[PDB]
Design a protein around this ligand. Structure first.
Ligand SMILES: Nc1ncnc2c1ncn2[C@@H]1O[C@H](COP(=O)(O)OP(=O)(O)OC[C@H]2O[C@H](O)[C@H](O)[C@@H]2O)[C@@H](O)[C@H]1O
Ligand SMILES: Nc1ncnc2c1ncn2[C@@H]1O[C@H](COP(=O)(O)OP(=O)(O)OC[C@H]2O[C@H](O)[C@H](O)[C@@H]2O)[C@@H](O)[C@H]1O
Ligand SMILES: NC(=O)[C@H]1CCCCc2c1[nH]c1ccc(Cl)cc21
Ligand SMILES: NC(=O)[C@H]1CCCCc2c1[nH]c1ccc(Cl)cc21
Ligand SMILES: NC(=O)[C@H]1CCCCc2c1[nH]c1ccc(Cl)cc21
Ligand SMILES: NC(=O)[C@H]1CCCCc2c1[nH]c1ccc(Cl)cc21
Ligand SMILES: [Zn+2]
Ligand SMILES: [Zn+2]
Lengths: 301, 300
């Protein structure tokens, strides 16, 4: 028995599902695409993404800048980049406030984000609503596993803006913000929330991510088989033919287009515009626009 | 659900002797051929990816990556000329799988190797999924053309220092070994759909399980199917870390408090298989097979 929960594979089909009694608990899965309209670059957009804009650091490959083994050999490019990107003041987007609407309508079980920009918090989601799957810059740690001395943000900021490579005062090993680099463990909260959240999710809303890194990309496969999954993104993601070096596990992807497609919908365009379009369908558009307006003005005050 | 009486080689052996254990699938990588003189990829210092400095690659894997290959095919065809001429013998591990087949237990061997030592050991093409392809045939890389060429054609080009070119469309021609970014053989998929439905035991040997989709295979068995790893190091087990190869929960659980079906025997693949053969009472038989087959090869 496969439960067929969407009456059609469109944004309109999803919206009707959301209004029904059957849709109680939504998980948002989000990445750097939801913050681009605020001024923050993403990673893997050709030419505009951060990984196509690190020429000056002379890295062996772009991912090295956020990679734990490279970092330990050559910490300077990371701290140089942090000094550049940290100052930027950004505001949440329409997409972030849409998630606030879910929260305030009793629909948000959790937002899992791969971003460190904190814009989900700034938009009004609370700690408990959030899994910051790829860490936070708020706290820092010595990288030495036998030490792990914790340091606060003021300590880290002071080091970066004094152009001093932060070192632990106990063991002299490098210190870094708790943002998750390639090769580094995810916060424990990720796994503990995931195990219970994904048993009871009625809709996955996947926004502004290419699903190109594990274990985050595995989350789509943790949902029950009947749970509809809506992608709002510039491009399809999670749907590709298998090949050697593919990121997802075999049969772990999205199925928007095949003869067997039953539950996955791709809305192709900007996240803000897709969130506006979906809010319109749900009768929430004015409320959303009102909230954005009010919260931006308040942020300026 | 627990089928092993204990999570040890002994427990696995007793399970293999039970009526329940009809169908065994072997999942193998380059570790089963190191004792035969062939380097693996990822072992420190000795592995192939730690010994490509001369080709000045941006990263080691680029030598077996399709887009890099089209732009710079010279390194791979240089590397192939060095390695193709080596002559090697199947290992005790390879003959242990031959024994599985002859005992009527082998449903399939899925290999990530292109050395053919499985075939040389006596496994037949029907027993095999050569998951990462074969050198025996070669194809033009152009999707509109796909002209096939045999081994003789490819060797003539390699050993004359001529970058192989399709005689029709002039595109590059490579052996049907699977590069990063390339499709796996059709057979991998059709066999996978059918083989893992009723599989009673997975035997994973000599692989770091560091590449997809091959690494997914362990998670295709039913949840109750025991899985035994014979390998120098543990593979398939970690906490969630960014960039990990395994899907979340698609790995092995040897050491957790909830561990119920995975067993890791750490050591040499050869000695591992001997130890298991011993526990099944096959040790003399295996040793006889190895000796005769190695003598047969020596006799050229
Ligand atoms: N305004 C927009 N509207 C909709 N989609 C967009 C927009 N802007 C960009 N996109 C799409 O948004 C997607 C952005 O994908 P990626 O750039 O890979 O970011 P990630 O968050 O998935 O990266 C994950 C991790 O990898 C890193 O190493 C870090 O660890 C990250 O946390 C693309 O599909 C764009 O087409
Ligand atoms: N004699 C031995 N006994 C036991 N274990 C061994 C032995 N020798 C090596 N090992 C272990 O055996 C493992 C060797 O793992 P890797 O070197 O990654 O080879 P793969 O076949 O998995 O590489 C997969 C693909 O990656 C490439 O891109 C190609 O596409 C390959 O087909 C390690 O865990 C060793 O500790
Ligand atoms: N908008 C975000 O926050 C994205 C994109 C901007 C750069 C920082 C960044 C993001 N996600 C990350 C995950 C891990 C690390 Cl080390 C850094 C980042
Ligand atoms: N500018 C900021 O508001 C935040 C969030 C936006 C992305 C850049 C970014 C921030 N903090 C960082 C710390 C380190 C790095 Cl590499 C990048 C960043
Ligand atoms: N020499 C041979 O017995 C075989 C199997 C052993 C590994 C090397 C190897 C062989 N054939 C090859 C063709 C191309 C490349 Cl790149 C490498 C090889
Ligand atoms: N013993 C094998 O055959 C291993 C290790 C020796 C090098 C060739 C090689 C192996 N596996 C492969 C998979 C794909 C490619 Cl392109 C090449 C190889
Ligand atoms: Zn320390
Ligand atoms: Zn051709």
């Amino acid at each position: 028995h496969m439960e067929r929960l969407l009456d059609e594979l469109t944004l309109e089909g999803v919206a009707r599902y959301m209004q029904s009694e059957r849709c109680r608990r939504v998980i948002c899965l989000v990445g750097a695409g939801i913050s681009t309209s605020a001024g923050i670059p993403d990673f893997r957009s050709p030419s505009t993404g951060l990984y196509d804009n690190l020429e000056k650091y002379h890295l062996p490959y772009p991912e090295a800048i956020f990679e734990i083994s490279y970092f330990k050999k050559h910490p300077e490019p990371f701290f140089a980049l942090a000094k550049e990107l940290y100052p930027g003041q950004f505001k949440p987007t329409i997409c972030h406030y849409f998630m606030r609407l879910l929260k305030d309508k009793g629909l948000l079980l959790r937002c899992y984000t791969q971003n460190i920009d904190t814009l989900e918090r700034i938009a009004g989601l609370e700690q408990e609503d959030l899994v910051e799957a790829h860490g936070t810059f708020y706290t820092s740690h010595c990288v030495s596993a036998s030490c792990r001395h914790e340091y606060p943000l003021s300590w880290m900021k002071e080091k970066i803006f004094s152009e001093v490579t932060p070192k632990c005062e106990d063991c002299q090993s490098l210190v870094k913000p708790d943002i998750v680099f390639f090769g580094e463990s995810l916060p424990a909260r990720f796994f503990s929330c995931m195990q219970s959240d994904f048993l009871k999710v009625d809709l996955l809303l996947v926004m502004g991510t290419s699903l190109q890194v594990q274990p985050f990309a595995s989350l789509i496969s943790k949902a029950p088989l009947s749970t509809p999954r809506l992608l709002i993104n510039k491009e399809k993601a999670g749907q590709s033919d298998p090949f050697l070096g593919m990121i997802m596990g075999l049969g772990g992807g999205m199925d928007f287009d095949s003869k067997k497609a039953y539950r996955d919908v791709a809305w192709l365009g900007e996240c803000d515009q897709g969130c506006l379009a979906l809010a319109e369908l749900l009768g929430w558009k004015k409320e959303l626009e009102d909230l954005v307006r009010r919260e931006h003005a308040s942020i300026d005050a």
